Amino acid sequence: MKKIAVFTGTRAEYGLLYWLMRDIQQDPELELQILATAMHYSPEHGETWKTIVKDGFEITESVEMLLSSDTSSAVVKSMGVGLLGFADALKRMQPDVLVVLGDRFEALAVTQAALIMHVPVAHLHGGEITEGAYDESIRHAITKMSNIHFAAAEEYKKRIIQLGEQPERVFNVGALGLDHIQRTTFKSISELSELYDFDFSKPYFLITYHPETNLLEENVAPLFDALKQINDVNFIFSYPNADNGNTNIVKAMLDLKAQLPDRVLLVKSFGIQNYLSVLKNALAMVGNSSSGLSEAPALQVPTVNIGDRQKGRLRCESILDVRLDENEIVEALQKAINFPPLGLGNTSQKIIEVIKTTDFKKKAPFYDLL
């Protein structure tokens, strides 16, 4: 009975890890532990740890750590509190394996805590290329302190190889989140249209434009005016998150809903099942969400990628890359109406297979390229 502890710090990342947690919980050979921390205990986001409990899981250890502040100094302090909690948490849990996904600073903290305390780390989504002040550097740092690696694609795996990891410790298992695509029973057009009292049979664009944190120059107009110049198609939207530019986007939306209440639908939180059901019958996922570069291509729905929020990500034919001016965009919406590396969506079982069949208690020797 191997103890596999899954680390989770945010609602979205937990949504990525959901099916792996479910599979471990279902498997009688593997005991699932959970270490929930960071934004799961922020009132800002509604204490999303309760969601973990409502989906049927038991939080083994909880570490509140986030300071109530927007300074970087307070992020360092939050990381210190995180380390102090993770010391006793891992001390009590004694996991056989710790699962860490992504590149957030709390994941770096728990990764180094596991390194010092000899808890082998399985890192998910290593070797990728993103944007930000430091998210990528942190991602590679987490890679170097992890014992086994589950990359979402072959080039990510090979960049992990270049990072010094031995090839027998890196596995291309696809993107874990896409398991939802494989395991969702989708809602029909009828069901979506009666649950939201809005007709989905008429063609619709689905959009999630999240605030570009560094792009302070967030003129919101260049796209939605471009949605007024394209007719015949409805606009269904869900709401952005909590960054710097949240309101200036949200009202850009709501006035293009006040202007045409008979072409626009506003959904606060979709839920992964209804979200994928809405995206499934779309002519385009447009915006800068990561769903545009994974879930939309896996559903054979084209995506028109606006801005550089998703720069560095694997591109595919369904991706149509554009900026935030009006011209170049509409050719891309039409270019959606006129017509994969990340895998199919069985990532959880591949990960479990590797964990059951591979010894990785020790960090393998550094791998030098000839």
Ligand X SMILES: O=c1ccn([C@@H]2O[C@H](COP(=O)(O)OP(=O)(O)O)[C@@H](O)[C@H]2O)c(=O)[nH]1
Site for ligand X in 197-226 (CB under 6 A): 208, 210
**By C-beta, is 152 or 304 nearer to its own copies?**
152
Binding of residue 338 to its own copies (CB under 8 A): no
State the Cα–Cα distance between residues 237 and 207, nearest whole angstrom.
Answer: 5
Q: Is 19 exposed, middle or buried (0-12, 13-18, 19+ CB in 10 A)?
A: buried
Quickly count: other Cβ atoms within 10 Å of residue 16's Cβ: 22
Is residue 325 within 8 Å of residue 226, measured between CB atoms?
no
Binding of residue 266 to ligand X (CB under 6 A): no
Is residue 95 within 8 Å of residue 122, measured between CB atoms?
no
Question: Would the annotation count 11 as a binding residue?
Answer: yes
Site string for its own copies, 70-109 (x = CB under 8 A): xxxxxxxx-xxxxxxxxxxxxx-------------x--x-
Binding of residue 163 to ligand X (CB under 6 A): no
| Residue 49: φ, ψ to 5° | -60, -35
Site for its own copies in 294-313 (CB under 8 A): 312
Is residue 205 within 8 Å of residue 223, measured between CB atoms?
no
Question: Would the annotation count 275 as a binding residue?
Answer: yes
Site for its own copies in 157-186 (CB under 8 A): 159, 162-164
Strands 97-101 and 2-8: parallel
Binding of residue 270 to ligand X (CB under 6 A): yes
**By C-beta, is 65 or 124 nearer to its own copies?**
65
Site for ligand X in 3-42 (CB under 6 A): 11-12, 15
State the Cα–Cα distance between residues 243 and 214, nearest whole angstrom.
Answer: 10
Binding of residue 133 to its own copies (CB under 8 A): yes
State the Cα–Cα distance between residues 110 and 118, nearest whole angstrom.
Answer: 12
Question: Would you list the DSSP string of 298-312?
Answer: HTT--EEEESSTTTT
**Contacted by 289, from ligand X, its own copies, none: CB < 5 to 8 Å by type:** ligand X
What minimum distance in Å lies between the beta carbon of 250 and its own copies?
9
Question: Would you list the DSSP string of 82-98?
Answer: HHHHHHHHHHHH--SEE
**By C-beta, is 91 or 202 nearer to its own copies?**
91
Question: CA angle, 49 as apex, 46 and 50 as ends, to 5°?
Answer: 80
* Sole window of 134-142, 193-201, 258-266, 340-348 interacting with its own copies (rule: CB under 8 A): 134-142
Question: Would the annotation count 125 as a binding residue?
Answer: yes
What minimum distance in Å lies between the beta carbon of 335 and its own copies?
27
Binding of residue 269 to ligand X (CB under 6 A): yes
CA-to-CA separations, 93 to 96, 100, 114, 316, in angstroms, rounded = 9, 15, 11, 41
**Contacted by 118, from ligand X, its own copies, none: CB < 5 to 8 Å by type:** its own copies
Site for ligand X in 284-343 (CB under 6 A): 289-291
Kind plus residue range of the DSSP H or E element containing 285: strand 284-287
Q: Which amino acid is at 306?
A: I
* Sole window of 185-193, 194-202, 216-224, 283-291 interacting with ligand X (rule: CB under 6 A): 283-291
Helix (H, G, I), strand (E, B) or coil at 206: strand
Question: Would the annotation count 295 as a binding residue?
Answer: yes
**By C-beta, is 95 or 292 nearer to ligand X?**
292
**By C-beta, is 94 or 327 nearer to its own copies?**
94
List residues near ligand X by CB under 6 A: 11-12, 15, 177, 208, 210, 238-239, 241, 268-270, 272, 275, 289-291
Annotated binding site: 11, 125, 128, 139, 210, 270-271, 275, 290-291, 295, 309-310, 313
